[PDB]
Symmetry: C4
């Protein structure tokens, strides 16, 4: 097994949790091909974000919420929707398919790294910035889906 | 990620949309083994062609329609059926299994390449000629299925 | 695509048709792990043999029928059941699991190689001897399943 | 096919039987990402252990039973549950998710190696010690699942 960073280990879990149908090894081919697929993917991610406390194996805290934005041509216009846990009202989204540039879902998760316990140390803090992108910049009929993260580390 | 041409990017989307059960990396093994599979595959492709506007993530225009042909031994006889969107009457197809040479579904899709917008340029036009082949020339009990395209580019 | 013989092309179709859940590239790992799986596999193969005319994309003729045998310890005892198309009475099979050596399904399919037509030649004849084996000789709790063939060629 | 030991052949069967959704080649990526998945996995393993006689293709004898333990932070506390075939009362398990270190399912299976018969020899005895681990020591939101075994061999 190849070693990765703590953030990366967490990120793999994030891909399984937020990306519908995701499976290991499909990172650079994972994509959407229909409107329904793109809708299900977006909703699944948000639903999962809202259900996180009752399903995740990790212990992530929200950091207020979630921004669902879609960028399309009117000039590029960004159109964002806010989702404040604890749960909805956003399932009436209408994608500007013909004008679509991309769609992004952005949110942050806060957590502790418990590996410190084995060495009798107070765990330090990790705040993950999650960005899920449905990229349509190639306007090719194929929209690749990706999830990347960035971590802010500091003592709690 | 390996770069491919615009036509090729579009073609990958076409394989996911028109080939039933298709999945990346199965291009040279993708095939049919039963009559039902061959029937479902053909119908799925045509149905998808008819539903294109309500499902595709790309913006393809029809170019009048779709030709469903089957070639079999009487001398090789070609037997074509026309499908003019916007939708049917062709689901009563009867495949000459024992005589079957192949079956092809041919149609063209017209679209614009919006990548021009980022450089403030008028998009040029692409007309894709789609050919789906169910090849039975080996008469081996295995019919490989393939989708290939050709593009006609010009200013709109 | 790697060239194989006509028999081999046909054999690939046979694996898709008679082996339940079979998929390309799983030939040397394909196996059964439960009694139900082993029962479903055996029945699926026989059912498929009986339905062959209404489902196969090839044109295979029976050569009278099908022998379902199981070998187990009493000395190794072979216990065969006959299936004469056109269809049953064999679904009451009781596998000597604890004593099981293996199980084999044997039958022959006769057909013509139509590739001759393109060169205006009378097709020669192929008689395939199909042998499906559920090997339990390792008595390891894992029974690998395999299908192999042999061809008898001659003018019709 | 690569040769492995008798124990290893048996172990592969054990992975297919006790690990939910397991498939060949996924050994070092196989993991759980949700509470429900972790619950289903644990229950599936135990249920399978209890049903073993009616489903397995091997002939394994119990060696009294099965220990379902979970380790979590109060200091690391181990909390075990006993399952004595022939069947339950353990499906009311409550996982200390936030405190979870790991979870292990331990049991032993006894059997004979019938390969001796082909050489007219009395089979020797194998007692497999099975250990299924749901490792959460990385506290990364991803819990890798693994099954390993050890064998005690001796004349019966």
């Amino acid at each position: 097994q190849l070693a990765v960073t703590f953030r990366e280990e967490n990120t793999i879990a994030f891909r399984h949790l937020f990306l519908l149908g995701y499976s290991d090894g499909a990172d650079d081919t994972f994509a959407a091909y229909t409107r329904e697929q793109l809708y299900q993917a977006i909703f699944h991610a948000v639903d999962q974000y809202l259900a996180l406390p009752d399903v995740s194996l990790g212990r992530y805290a929200y950091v207020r919420g979630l921004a669902l934005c879609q960028r399309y041509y009117h000039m590029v216009v960004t159109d964002c929707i806010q989702v404040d846990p604890p749960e909805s009202s956003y399932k009436n989204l209408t994608l500007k398919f013909h004008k679509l540039v991309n769609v992004t879902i952005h949110f942050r998760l806060k957590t502790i790294n418990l590996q410190s316990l084995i060495n009798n140390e107070i765990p330090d803090c990790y705040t993950f910035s999650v960005l899920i992108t449905f990229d349509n910049k190639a306007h090719s009929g194929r929209i690749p889906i990706s999830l990347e993260t960035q971590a802010h580390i500091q003592e709690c």
